[PDB]
Design a protein around this nucleic acid. Sequence first.
DNA 1: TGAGGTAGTAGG
DNA 2: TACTACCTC
Length: 688
Amino acid sequence: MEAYITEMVSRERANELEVYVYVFPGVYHIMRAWQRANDLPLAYNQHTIMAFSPVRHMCGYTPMETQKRHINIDSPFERALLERLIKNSLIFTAERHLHAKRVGHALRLNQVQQIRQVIIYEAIELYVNIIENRISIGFHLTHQFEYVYTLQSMIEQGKTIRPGMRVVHSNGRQHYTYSTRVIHVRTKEQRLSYAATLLKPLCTFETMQPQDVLNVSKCIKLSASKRMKCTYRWIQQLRAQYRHLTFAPNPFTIAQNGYKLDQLSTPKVHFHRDYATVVSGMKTGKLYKGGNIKISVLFDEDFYLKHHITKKDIYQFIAVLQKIAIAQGVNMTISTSTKSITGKFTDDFFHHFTEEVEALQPIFAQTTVLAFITSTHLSNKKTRSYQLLKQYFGGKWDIASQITEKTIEAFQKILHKHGLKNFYPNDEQHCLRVIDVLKNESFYYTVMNILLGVYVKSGIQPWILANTTHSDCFIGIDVSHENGNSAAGMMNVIGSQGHLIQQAPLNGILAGEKIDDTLLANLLKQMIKAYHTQFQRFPKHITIHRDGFWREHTALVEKIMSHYEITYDIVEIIKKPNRRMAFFNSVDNTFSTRQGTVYQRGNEAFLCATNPQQKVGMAQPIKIHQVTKTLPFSHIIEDVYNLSFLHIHAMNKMRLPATIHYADLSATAYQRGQVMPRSGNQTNLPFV
DNA sequence: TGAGGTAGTAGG
DNA sequence: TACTACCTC
Ligand SMILES: Nc1ccn([C@H]2C[C@H](O)[C@@H](COP(=O)(O)O)O2)c(=O)n1
Ligand SMILES: [Mn+2]
Ligand SMILES: [Mn+2]
Ligand SMILES: [Mn+2]
């Protein structure tokens, strides 16, 4: 049982390697010509070319000087140039002595399986870094899709083609997506057309026939022991034919990479008592902060004409929700203004939505709206009911909203199977039977997810963290880019235990792709004033979480926040680090992954936070970086892990911590004009 | 869109 | 960043 990482560190140092350096008065074509003529791995940066071996054929270009030298480790220019040379030499050593082809951003290896005109290829990606005078090489394994035939098969052998189809030109190095017959095709609107014997059709999931996406998906889900044993079996074959660097016989363990192993424990949640599991008291507990909710029902008549479900069947569903809500300490009352709008939400109302939507505002104000729109009307690209509802109900008038035919049909199929078809509204001793049949099966999670989405949008806190963290205030920041527009993702967590989780009441529209200084200052000041409002005292420490890389002004975070004599940390959280971690079991020769595992090396860490099943895939590690050093890094990791269990919006555990997950959701929603600011002191998460 | 997690694809 | 498939609860 040893901890394994998909990285290695070379025995040689950055200063133990001698290289040849040429400097010329950008210079891509010189390197290209030298590489073509000499058949040797070269690398270039700005106006300097570096290699491991001298160039024989000079290609008529004169440098100022030639050096057979060691690099200068105190400069970043010669550490960036060298990191590309090992990569290029490894690619060179992969193309020869191994049948690999540099396609896109990866190295296609070989065909593993063909599924009815669909070919799957294995591919690998390599990364080189220079850290602390050590050369680190990381590697990742992926797949690639291709179609067997080309435009010839759609011209010859019958068949035909139609305009708008996406085609792929793959000339080896990189591919573009757009002599018997010439077919025009354009994506950049620049005229181009040529032979239809090498343009293939695109192989994405969306443009793929059924019975394939069901079998092309079982050939990319390698559980834990076939994604890892196959990644190592190729690097260990590339090693045997690489001469410029040397490694240990087993360079994949974390000890060879200088990592430290930490095993975090499962937190506890508090609501009227201490519960070990988040899903342990939702069945048998009382919510931490209850209250009163006035719900509304928006019923569509297309839900009846096309699907044999009567409006009354909506109210024997709500009555099941309320009977569950009276337990846990929540009061739901149906608004009385919905009786004057009977027979109004017809099909023409969805075709004509913008013109006749204002008059709905008075009858839905100060309530929570439950929409029962059809799946088609939400998914259709003409009606676009979901986007309009989000943009009007929440984005304009600030009312929370939360069901298609699949849910109701599954509920009624369950009811019919159990044989209960009598009245289940305003009838005790029978709603309990419906609740019992709902339990012991998987629709209970659907019911509780709906209930939790209603609660968190109504201002109810379902639970907090039983124990206390090492920080006081948590701030989550995120940026979303779409169609040349950027949206910020401010998010506030007040209390060490996670007492009050809300969204910063700030205008998240950004002129640029980064947060302005004034916005950051206002965010910090409002965070301080909101923690003071609830706890009557100023916070002692604050930990800022940033999704991605910290690009803001670090010198300004302290300029205002020192003035309050409060300590702070800045943390970067990276999703998709393009690495994997495992626990190899020598006795059984099988890989596995354990939740709450940390690999630590200085101010950087890899964390495992999820436990997916065999058929879903393999867990994705998270990367944690600490820009500051005010607090121990272990206490930084512990807070990131514990904060991930505060998924009060849903009932299924999420991977990222609460701040950044809700920051991403808030940025996505507020990019689309679906959320508007609301000052207050309650748990407000409308975007979910 | 009940909720979430993983894996592919495209552009920046 | 965005999209699409699947499985799990
Ligand atoms: N493969 C990727 C990864 C990130 N991105 C986006 C997400 C961010 O807006 C930005 C990268 O930011 P960061 O590397 O700090 O996470 O580019 C992308 O467009 N393609
Ligand atoms: Mn981001
Ligand atoms: Mn995001
Ligand atoms: Mn939701």
